[PDB]
Every structure is written in structure tokens, then in C-alpha cells.
Design a protein around this ligand. Structure first.
Ligand code: SF4
Ligand code: SF4
Ligand code: SF4
Ligand code: FES
Ligand code: FES
Ligand SMILES: [Ca+2]
Lengths: 147, 905, 156
């Protein structure tokens, strides 16, 4: 649809900047998530990571400078460039600027996914956003990041 | 740079790795995945040390010595608590799943994993769970494979892919079920697969030929010798036990053949322990053969030579300099004929003229890899001598190396270099009759006859310099390819021109010399190398003499009634019927040889000469350097009836008994004095190894390690009374353990690599001033040549275009690696590896003959209609039939010769 | 005796049109062979190596490295049940026992009629919706051991 609308191709809305987008569906190994091993798997090789400090920003995929970014980083950048920078610094009074897709999972009453600003404690998320846990559970432990 | 290890200041290189800098200082850091010739990866974590930035620090950080650059201001520590217990944990993790089969392992006392397990000091086992097992694979007749012993250090695939360029072995597996090998079962088609025995620190890839008739490393009597299979002259360490040669090891030499051998030189030692070898002086009288000792055989041979009127000494390129000169002194100097064809001798003389009179520096094997472009003219480098082809592979990778170095990344991390490179290759232009194994990395491959390759070289030389003679009839697309070649060569800082005498024509050598002169005339740092046929063919050319055909005419005419053939088959260098008739017409034939050849029949006397495992001698490289090989064992230690004396010893005693009627068992350095006092061109060979009266700190050098076993029961099956150790007056070596193999000894030639705590082939790093570089206290062999001030002239003789004809067929050489040498094909292990004798036809030629692939056709040479099955070759040209040189019944003289009557059998 | 169909060659060549290096399309070529034939046979490695130009060792290593590139023959329906920790808390041992009692096999093996092949999977990315599984690129969440025979009867 973006290619049909004149974007994501050659001379995007009369700029001369040429960009082409592709989707590479991997077969699946958890080590492919790391950036150097993602680069190695993108080149059709086994997904072994690479040593540092030869960085991907200097020599990545096929010896060319590359940048690997998460989905949420590239979902947060267009809101930054569309709404401003001072607005992005003025949504949460914490050292980590911006919003994060947080949420609890595992025998919870409402295990879901909600976008919340940084500095929000896990307790309020668990008791109101997750709604607490189910009947007969005492919440003996938790893990901030997934596994 | 200045670093501080263990609270002690050291001065190491700045751009190298910390692991190699610490190993160059004699310190001990265990390692599994780093190799000096393969770069550094992180497949293990064995080289861990503790690094500090400031002069004083408490915690530090556990880093890898092969990933840390040896920069100015690093304060690393090795034998602290944390790094030592981490290395102990890593060797514990390697012994987590390792089979309990050390005494039934081919490595045993040659295993790096044992050395680094003992060095870390880990004996108590806390692992109680099950181990990991794998199946096995059949990797041909050379490399025995078993996967249980592996530690996943990735050195095998790193060598086999990045260094050797092989497209067979690789990594197939997962987290713990990681496999190293081939997707199917079959022979490794790479010509460098035999270096996996020493590349692998474990017993995964082992020597099958040494697995049969196996002995341990400490039981091996070693010697420093030279490989006699082709002209590259790689320094080897043959090692024997119980009177038979058992294993050839790679001998380190930083100028030629640093770390890797080829398959032919590694596995073609099966001819010296054949049971049909001449072990006695056998003389035939009447119609039956009698066996003599040395004394009365020498007396009888001298009597028959005295009764003769003229003696013809036919040398061989396989024989040493000392033996050929001993023949040249036994017979007259005016009549001494080199055992090669007239065309072969002309090509060898032209190659020597280019080498020592062309004014162009000839690179050694190590410094071929530092050149910026390679042009190979008419030479199957990957099949004649493959070590230059491996160095060409490294020179091709040099472009990726220098492009990575332009990005300010270190040179010891090969992963980043191959990351930056990405199939970026230096210009490699190979010309041959058919496809080569270098075509995978070559910038261009030219499939054409020998005359067309020579004309291509003449076109390259004319485009590089207009003073060269022009060649006409060049097609515009071929002219564009010439333009591409010359603009790649003109932009190269250090171009290289490779040729050889195996092409079968003089004009290819002339074209290579013309291109080298054109590159030198414009100020480039051009090098030129020529791959000769046999191990000491260039020494035979330097000594010189008549061709074999001149000797055959002399024998057929009747001017000489006595012929002495030294270590020559005589059927590879001339036609069989003519040689047989000439030898039958001669009233006296003496054959001084170590192999049962076809000329021993109807030969009046056979002298049991000694092979390179049983003789001392000097061989001259294709580069031009003169190295010398030493004896491994005394053949009379077991089965004392046999003598098996050296060829030069036999001929010199024959000459002495001819003159003074007395037998003189002389000494090797006397023969060296003779060759440096008689031949001024050979005056430099008394600098490779010193005199026999050379003892460092008073004592000699040991053939065998200090733990030589069974010294009082090795010969007890025939005599409990232990014989005296064989006294060696020829060399600086004693035959038993009381010599010296200390790494810090003032010497250039090392029998074997053994250090306390280092029982592996990775113990060679203690014998070098810097690891992975040159050998300490110099290198074996001296150059014997200097770059001439004034070069040759431009060779005006440009050959014409090869025009095919229907009646006459041109024989195209192929030179299979395992079948183009008599000494290689005499080995029983090469028979299951070598291909069957075939012939090669064009599709158009097969259509005009009406035959299909696999059908026998009969061709007539020397009046013999012999039949061979055909193969369809796409790269071959019309009017040419392809033949494997060096085969049984197919002499290498036929390369460039014509063929008639190509009829279907 | 393996050979490549015309559609396979067109798809593989169009995939190599998307990358600078033809080596980068090896995983997608193996995936195309998997989508057409169900698994990657021995001759397919050499076919992909000959089409792409990379050696067969690299293709074999790529095929044997990634989990969802099957080299052993599988059934017509690959059941891929979650083996991770969130579905462990939500309960995957019950549905594993239900599958083992229904198909009468062990994980990693196929049924005798070739109808199903049971396999654990690292994760499905559907952690918030309870235990999850995939059958023939069809995902299922909020699973119960009682609904396993009902869920398994809609596949051929
Ligand atoms: S087979 Fe040998 S060289 Fe290869 S990874 Fe294993 S231990 Fe290292
Ligand atoms: S490779 Fe070394 S450690 Fe392994 S079984 Fe052989 S001798 Fe023992
Ligand atoms: S390249 Fe030649 S000299 Fe070197 S090991 Fe091989 S056969 Fe021997
Ligand atoms: S030697 Fe293997 S990590 Fe350095
Ligand atoms: S843990 Fe099962 S879907 Fe992620
Ligand atoms: Ca001797």
C-alpha cells in the first residue's frame, strides 16, 4: 500500500531519497534476536554472533554500515518527529524518557499489554492494569523482563 | 608496545594479539581455537587473563588473550586465582562430554587437549551425568574421522574454508549437537585435507595411513628431511619405528612451508617401506641372481668398469646433488647425461635462466602470500605443487586483509577481516588446458592449448610494454580480456608471475619471462616463480649434462659398453621400447636405485641405494634454495643382512675402487667439499646445515624423544644382546635419545617439536622467536641465488595459433596430484585414492569419433595400440585429447607430443 | 534422485533478486522447499547449493542449525506446542499429556499413519493468551486439555 501511495520507493514525495523495504521471515532460533547474530542470519549463514568492537555501525551486513533497531524504537520515533522533542521529554518525569509497552503475565486475572510512561511501579500495574491475580494465589515472585 | 604481565614489564609488538605476544615471550597461556596461521576467534574461552587499565587496580576484567590487542599500557595477569580457576572450569566443561578412550586414540601423546588439561591442573571430576555421543563418517583413505573427541573449537572448518578454500567440510549442528565434517560420506576432495591431523587439537581428524601400523609419538624416531614428491621442497619430519617409516609430520620453517603440507607429500611415504624394494646388492650371472655384500660387489663392478671402454652415467632429477655429482665423478665429466628428455631439459634450462639471469626476484613460499596480483601461465599449480596454490589463495585474501586494515581493525581477528571483505579478491588470472581447482577464487580462467596460453602471455607483455613483440590475430573480446588483465596488473603493487616446466612448451616460459620483464621495466615489484617437475630437477639443471636421448643414441650406436643409471625409471623420460632396446644392447647395465623399476630386468648389477628415509643428501628448490635432508634410521639395525647404503656412497666407493683398487666408505661433508670445490654454481650448499662436527654445548642432536621406549626389547625377538647404536659420521645427529632438542638451542634444523607441557604439533611455537613467524636462529636452507643486476632480453619467438588437424591429435597434460609421480603412485594407500587411467575428449571430437562417455578407445603411440575410457571435457578444445601425465605407461614426456589413430576399440 | 520444480526456481531467483549476496536467500530457499514438499531431503541441499552457488556444506549447516527446517520426514500436520515458561505457569503439561494420550506418541516423533508430528517450540509470542500451539501455520490460544480432541479433529 505504501508503494502504491508513492512512498517507500524512489523519490519519496519528491525528495530523491531512494529506500526499499523487505521482509525476511526467519526459520527461528532464539540467538537470531541479537544484532550481530541477526546480521549473520540475514547473510544466509549460521546465526553465530560477532566479536566487538568491530561494530555493525561500521561493518555489519556484507561489510556495510548497518543499524539494527527494535520494533518499539521505530514505533516511538515517528511520534517524536510528528509531535516534537520537548513534548517527548514532557510526558514522564524520569530519567528514561518516553513510554513503554508494559504488562504482567502468568496466572493473572487480566494478563495483557498496556502502554505506560516510565517510572510507573509494577505494583500499581499489577493491581489495577492487571487487576490483581486469580483466586488462591499469593504472588511469591515476579520477573521484570520476559525470561 | 610495552605491556605488564604478572607484575612484570615486557616489550612486545603493538599490532599483534596478546596471546601470540605472550606465547612469543615463552609464557604459558592455554588455548584451543586460536591458530597462528588462522587468526583468532572465540570458539573457546581458554586464553582468559585478567586485564587492568591503570597501574594499580583491584578487580579488573576477565578478557581473552586472543581478542585483546597488545597495546601500550595494559596490565594483565595470568596465574591469579580467578583466571586460573576459570580456565580450569573451561577445561572441565570440555571434559563434561569427552569419551574415555585416550589409550585407543591416534593422538595420545600428540594431543593438545591432554597438554592443556594437564597445564591447567584439572584431575578431579565433579561431572556425574551422561556424556554426548556422535556417529562417524568416512572421509577417504587419509583422514580417519570420529566426532566424540571434539571440543567444538572450530579450527578445522576455519582452516578448511577460509585458509584451504575447500568446499566440503563445515559445521552442521546446534547448541550442543554441533557436528564438524561432510554432509555425506566421501573423500575430501581438497588437496590440503591432510593438515587437519595437526590443525585439530583432538583425535577427531587423524592420519589413517599412520592409524594402520600405529605407534605413539615418543616411540617415533624423527628426522628433519625434505619432501621428495615435487619441487616445492616442503620441510618435513619423517618418523619411523621398527625399521619402517610410519609418519610424516609438518616441519616448521618460516620461509617455506610454515604450517601446512599438501596431501601428496603428507601421504606418499608408502613406497619406502614396500617389500619389493632392493635391499641387497643383487648381481645376475648366467640366468640366475646372486646376492653379494658391499665389498665384493664393489670389487666386481670396478673390475667390469675397468674392462669396459666407456661409461655412461645417467642421473635422475629424483637423486640428490651429492649422488648425481658422485655419478658425474665416477663416469667422465664429458659423458654424463641428465635423465630427462631434450624438451624437458630445454624447459628446465630456460626456467633456470629466467630464475638466475632474469633480474627478477623469486619469492619463497611464505612471501607469495604478500603479493597483490597473480598471473599463472600454463601451470596446474593446484595439482603439480599445491603449496604455491595455497599461498596464492592467501595472496588473494590479502585484498580483504588490506581493506580491513584500511578500516583500522586488527589483523589477527579473521572474522572481522572476512566481514569487511565479502568476496573481495585480488586479481588472479589462471591459464590451463582444462578447469583447475583455483577457478573458484580466480578473477579469470583461460581454457586453451599451450600455444594459445603462450600467445595470451605475449599479448599481456605487449600491452604492458610496447617493446615486447606483438602477436596478431587477437579477437576483440580476447583483446578486452587482455586489457582487463593488464589494467589489473599495472595497478598491482607487487605482481606475481607463475609458470613451470610441466606446461610442456618453452613458449609459456618465454611469455612469463616477457610479462615479468615488462612489469619490471615500468617500476613494479614483480616476482616470478616456476614450479619444476621433480624435487631436485633444478639442481640437476644447475649441474647440467646431456639429455637422455643423447645417451640412448650413444648406447644404440655402441660407443659405450657400460651404463650406470642412478635412481631413474628411464620410462618416464623416454619411450619404453627404445630404452629397453638400448639397455639390452649395452653389455653392462648397473642400476643404483631404491625402488623396483622396470629396468632392473636384464640389468647386470643392481645396487640397493637408500631412499630419503635412509640417506643424507641435498635437494634444490623450485625457488632456487638448496636444502638438505637427513637419514631417519639405519636399515641394518633390523635385518642386518641388508646394507642399503647411500647412492653417493655407492658411486664414490665405486670411483675410489676404480682408481686405487681400494674401497672407501667416505663421509658426506667430503662430498660437500667436492661439490663446492668443483662446481662454483653449487658452492653455496655448505650453508644449509653445518658440518658433522657441529655440537651445541658439546653434544649432538637427537633423532628420538627423551622418552624412547623399549630400548632393551625392541630387537629382542632376534637377539637379546642389544647391538651398538648406529654411529652417524655423515651428519650432526646421533641416532638415540642423548642429543639435544631444546627450543632455545643455537640451531636452524629441528627434528620434531616437543616442549615440556607441549606434546602437540602446536609445540612449534616454542621454537620460534615470534610465534607464527620465522624459526628461531634462522631457517634451514640458503638461497643460493641472487637477483641479477641486468635481466634477459625480450623473447622474439611468438608461437603461432594452434590449428587442429584431423589426422594428428595433440596430447594435453593433466597431472593428477595423486598420480603424476612414480614415488607417489608406488605407495599402496594412493591406489584407492588415485583415479583410474582415463582419456579426455571434446564433445565435438567425441561426436566425430562416434563414441560416448565410458567407452574404450584405442590410440597408438610407439607402435602400441592402448585402450582407455573417455571423459567429456567442456573446457577442452578441439583437436586435443587429454591425458594424465605420470601414469602407469603414460610418461610425462607425452605432454605436448602428438597422437595418432584415435579409433574406438 | 532430487530435482527442483520450475516454481521453486522462479521463487528462489526472485528471492535472490532481493539481496546483495545470493547466499542470503539460502534460508528462504529451504523454506520454499519446506512449503512445497513438507521437509528438506538430502538432494535438496545440493540443489540449493548448485542454484545459489554457495557450497553444500553451508546449506547443510543452515538447514541443520535452525529448528523449523526439518530434515527428517514429518507428517502432514506439524503440531508445535509451547515449551517455555509462561505456558508452563499457565499449564502445558496437561495439554502435553492430552496429546500423548491422543496420538499415543512422544514429542519429536510422528504418528504411524503420518497424520501428526508432535514437536516442542521455544516460544510462540502469544504469552498473554495462555497456553498456545501451532498446527500447519494456524495458532491456538487459551487451550484446555479437554478441547484437544476437538481441536485435533479439524485437520486432514
Ligand atoms: S573437530 Fe577438532 S578442529 Fe574441529 S572444532 Fe572439533 S576439536 Fe576443533
Ligand atoms: S583427542 Fe586427546 S583427550 Fe580426546 S581421547 Fe584422544 S588423546 Fe584423549
Ligand atoms: S607441495 Fe610438493 S614438496 Fe610440498 S608436500 Fe606437496 S608434494 Fe611435497
Ligand atoms: S584462544 Fe580461544 S578464546 Fe582465545
Ligand atoms: S511462553 Fe508460550 S507463547 Fe510465549
Ligand atoms: Ca647416513
Amino acid at each position: 500500500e505504501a508503494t502504491e501511495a508513492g512512498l517507500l520507493g524512489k523519490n519519496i514525495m519528491g525528495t530523491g531519497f531512494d529506500f526499499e523495504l523487505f521482509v525476511h521471515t526467519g526459520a527461528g532460533r532464539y540467538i537470531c534476536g541479537e544484532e550481530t547474530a541477526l546480521i549473520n542470519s540475514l547473510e544466509g549463514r549460521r546465526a553465530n554472533p560477532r566479536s566487538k568492537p568491530p561494530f555493525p555501525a561500521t561493518s555489519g551486513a556484507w561489510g556495510k554500515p548497518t543499524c539494527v533497531n527494535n520494533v518499539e524504537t521505530l514505533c516511538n520515533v515517528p511520534a517524536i518527529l510528528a509531535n516534537g522533542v520537548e513534548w517527548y521529554q514532557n510526558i514522564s518525569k524520569s530519567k528514561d524518557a518516553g513510554t513503554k509497552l508494559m504488562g504482567f503475565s502468568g496466572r493473572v486475572k487480566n494478563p495483557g499489554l498496556w502502554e505506560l510512561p516510565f517510572g510507573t511501579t509494577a505494583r500499581e500495574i499489577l493491581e489495577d492494569y492487571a487487576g490483581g491475580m486469580r483466586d488462591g494465589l499469593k504472588f511469591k515472585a515476579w520477573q521484570p523482563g520476559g525470561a | 608496545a610495552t605491556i605488564h604481565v604478572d607484575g612484570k614489564e615486557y616489550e612486545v609488538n603493538g599490532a599483534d594479539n596478546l596471546l601470540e605476544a605472550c606465547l612469543s615471550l615463552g609464557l604459558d597461556i592455554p588455548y584451543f581455537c586460536w591458530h597462528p596461521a588462522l587468526g583468532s576467534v572465540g570458539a573457546c574461552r581458554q586464553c582468559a587473563v585478567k586485564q587492568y587499565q591503570n597501574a594499580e587496580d583491584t578487580r579488573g576484567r576477565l578478557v581473552m588473550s586472543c581478542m585483546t590487542p597488545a597495546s601500550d599500557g595494559t596490565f594483565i595477569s595470568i596465574d591469579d586465582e580467578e583466571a586460573k580457576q576459570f580456565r580450569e572450569s573451561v577445561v572441565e566443561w570440555l571434559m563434561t562430554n569427552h569419551p574415555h578412550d585416550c589409550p585407543v586414540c591416534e593422538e595420545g601423546g600428540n594431543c593438545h587437549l591432554q597438554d592443556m588439561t594437564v597445564m591447567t591442573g584439572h584431575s578431579f571430576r565433579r561431572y556425574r551425568f551422561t556424556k554426548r555421543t556422535h556417529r562417524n563418517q568416512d572421509l577417504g583413505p587419509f583422514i580417519s574421522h570420529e566426532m566424540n573427541r571434539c571440543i567444538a573449537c572450530y579450527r578445522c572448518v576455519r582452516y578448511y574454508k577460509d585458509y584451504a578454500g575447500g568446499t566440503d567440510l563445515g559445521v552442521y549442528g546446534a547448541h550442543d549437537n554441533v557436528y564438524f565434517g561432510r554432509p555425506e560420506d566421501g573423500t575430501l576432495e581438497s588437496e590440503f585435507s591432510g593438515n587437519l591431523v595437526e590443525i585439530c587439537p583432538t583425535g577427531v581428524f587423524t592420519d589413517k595411513t599412520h592409524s594402520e601400523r600405529y605407534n605413539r609419538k615418543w616411540d617415533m624416531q624423527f628426522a628433519p628431511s625434505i619432501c621428495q614428491q615435487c619441487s616445492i621442497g616442503c620441510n618435513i619430519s619423517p618418523g619411523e619405528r621398527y625399521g619402517e617409516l610410519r609418519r610424516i609430520e609438518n616441519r616448521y620453517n618460516g620461509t617455506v612451508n610454515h604450517y601446512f603440507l599438501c596431501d601428496r607429500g603428507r601421504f606418499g611415504y608408502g613406497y619406502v617401506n614396500l617389500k619389493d624394494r632392493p635391499r641387497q646388492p643383487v648381481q645376475r650371472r648366467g640366468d640366475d641372481f646372486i646376492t653379494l655384500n658391499a665389498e665384493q660387489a664393489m670389487q666386481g663392478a670396478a673390475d667390469i668398469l675397468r674392462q669396459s671402454k666407456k661409461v655412461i652415467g645417467i642421473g635422475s632429477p629424483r637423486a640428490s646433488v651429492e649422488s648425481n655429482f658422485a655419478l658425474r665423478e665416477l663416469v667422465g665429466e664429458e659423458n654424463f647425461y641428465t635423465g630427462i628428455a631434450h624438451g624437458e631439459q630445454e624447459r628446465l634450462q630456460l626456467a633456470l635462466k629466467v630464475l638466475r639471469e632474469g633480474g627478477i626476484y623469486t619469492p619463497a613460499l611464505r612471501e607469495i602470500e604478500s603479493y597483490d596480483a597473480v598471473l599463472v601461465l600454463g601451470e596446474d599449480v593446484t595439482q603439480t605443487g599445491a603449496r604455491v596454490a595455497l599461498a596464492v589463495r592467501q595472496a588473494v585474501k590479502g585484498k580483504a586483509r588490506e581493506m580491513a586494515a584500511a578500516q583500522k581493525v586488527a589483523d589477527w581477528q579473521i572474522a572481522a577481516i572476512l566481514n569487511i571483505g565479502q568476496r573481495a579478491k585480488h586479481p588472479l588470472f589462471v591459464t590451463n588446458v582444462d578447469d583447475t581447482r583455483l577457478d573458484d577464487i580466480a578473477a579469470w580462467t583461460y581454457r586453451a592449448p599451450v600455444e594459445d596460453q603462450a600467445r595470451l602471455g605475449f599479448a599481456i607483455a605487449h600491452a604492458l610494454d610496447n617493446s615486447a613483440p606483438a602477436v596478431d590475430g587477437i579477437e576483440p573480446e580476447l583483446q578486452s580480456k587482455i586489457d582487463v588483465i593488464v589494467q589489473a596488473l599495472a595497478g598491482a603493487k607487487k605482481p606475481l608471475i607463475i609458470s613451470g616446466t610441466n606446461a610442456g612448451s618453452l613458449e609459456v616460459i618465454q611469455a612469463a619471462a616477457n610479462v615479468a620483464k615488462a612489469l619490471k621495466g615500468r617500476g613494479a615489484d614483480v616476482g616470478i616463480t616456476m614450479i619444476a617437475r621433480s624435487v631436485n630437477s633444478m639442481g640437476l639443471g644447475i649441474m647440467g649434462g646431456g639429455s637422455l636421448e643423447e645417451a640412448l643414441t650413444e648406447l644404440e650406436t655402441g660407443r659405450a659398453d657400460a651404463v650406470v643409471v642412478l635412481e631413474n625409471d628411464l620410462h618416464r623420460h623416454a619411450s619404453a621400447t627404445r630404452v629397453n632396446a638400448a639397455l639390452a644392447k649395452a653389455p653392462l647395465v648397473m642400476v643404483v636405485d631404491h625402488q623396483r623399476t622396470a629396468i632392473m630386468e636384464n640389468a647386470h648389477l643392481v645396487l640397493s641405494a637408500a631412499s630419503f628415509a635412509e640417506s643424507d643428501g641435498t635437494v634444490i628448490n623450485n625457488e632456487g634454495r638448496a636444502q638438505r635432508f637427513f637419514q631417519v634410521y639405519d636399515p641394518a639395525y633390523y635385518d642386518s643382512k641388508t646394507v642399503m647404503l647411500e647412492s653417493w656412497r655407492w658411486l664414490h666407493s665405486l670411483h675410489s675402487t676404480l682408481l686405487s683398487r681400494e674401497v672407501d666408505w667416505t663421509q658426506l661433508d667430503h662430498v660437500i667439499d667436492a661439490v663446492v670445490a668443483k662446481i662454483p654454481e653449487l658452492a653455496g650448499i655448505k650453508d644449509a646445515a653445518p658440518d658433522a662436527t657441529f655440537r651445541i654445548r658439546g653434544q649432538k642432536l637427537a633423532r628420538e624423544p627423551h622418552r624412547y621406549s623399549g630400548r632393551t626389547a625392541m630387537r629382542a625377538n632376534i637377539s637379546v644382546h642389544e647391538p651398538r647404536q648406529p654411529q652417524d659420521i655423515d651428519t650432526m645427529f646421533t641416532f638415540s635419545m642423548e642429543g639435544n632438542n631444546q627450543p632455545t638451542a643455537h640451531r636452524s634444523q629441528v627434528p620434531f617439536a616437543w616442549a615440556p607441557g607441549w606434546n602437540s604439533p602446536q609445540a612449534w611455537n616454542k621454537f620460534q622467536d615470534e610465534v607464527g613467524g620465522k624459526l628461531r636462529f634462522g631457517d634451514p636452507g640458503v638461497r643460493l641465488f641472487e637477483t641479477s643486476e641486468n635481466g634477459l632480453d625480450y623473447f622474439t619467438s611468438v608461437p603461432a595459433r594452434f590449428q587442429p588437424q584431423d589426422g594428428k591429435w595433440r596430447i594435453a597434460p593433466y597431472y593428477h596430484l595423486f598420480g603424476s609421480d612414480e614415488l607417489s603412485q608406488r605407495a599402496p594407500v594412493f591406489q584407492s585414492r588415485m583415479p583410474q587411467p582415463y582419456i579426455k575428449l571434446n564433445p565435438a571430437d567425441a561426436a566425430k569419433l562416434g563414441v560416448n562417455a565410458g567407452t574404450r578407445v584405442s590410440f597408438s603411440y610407439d607402435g602400441n595400440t592402448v585402450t582407455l575410457p573417455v571423459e567429456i571435457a567442456e573446457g577442452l578444445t578441439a583437436g586435443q585429447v587429454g591425458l594424465p601425465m605420470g601414469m602407469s605407461g603414460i610418461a610425462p614426456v607425452l605432454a605436448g607430443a602428438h597422437l595418432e589413430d584415435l579409433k574406438e576399440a | 534422485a532430487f530435482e527442483l520444480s520450475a516454481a521453486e526456481r522462479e521463487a528462489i531467483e526472485h528471492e535472490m533478486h532481493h539481496y546483495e549476496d545470493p547466499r542470503a536467500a539460502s534460508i528462504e530457499a529451504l523454506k520454499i522447499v519446506q512449503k512445497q514438499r513438507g521437509w528438506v531431503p538430502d538432494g535438496a541441499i545440493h540443489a540449493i547449493a548448485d542454484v545459489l552457488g554457495i557450497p553444500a556444506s553451508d546449506v547443510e549447516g543452515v538447514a541443520t542449525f535452525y529448528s523449523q527446517i526439518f530434515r527428517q520426514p514429518v507428517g502432514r500436520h506439524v503440531i508445535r506446542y509451547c515449551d517455555s515458561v509462561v505456558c508452563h505457569i499457565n499449564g502445558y503439561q496437561g495439554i502435553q499429556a492430552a496429546l500423548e494420550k491422543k496420538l499415543n506418541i512422544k514429542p519429536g516423533q510422528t504418528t504411524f499413519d503420518g497424520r501428526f508430528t508432535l514437536l516442542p517450540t521455544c516460544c510462540l509470542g502469544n504469552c498473554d493468551k495462555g497456553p498456545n500451539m501451532m498446527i500447519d501455520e494456524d495458532t491456538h490460544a487459551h487451550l484446555t486439555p479437554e478441547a484437544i480432541p476437538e481441536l485435533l479433529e479439524r485437520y486432514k
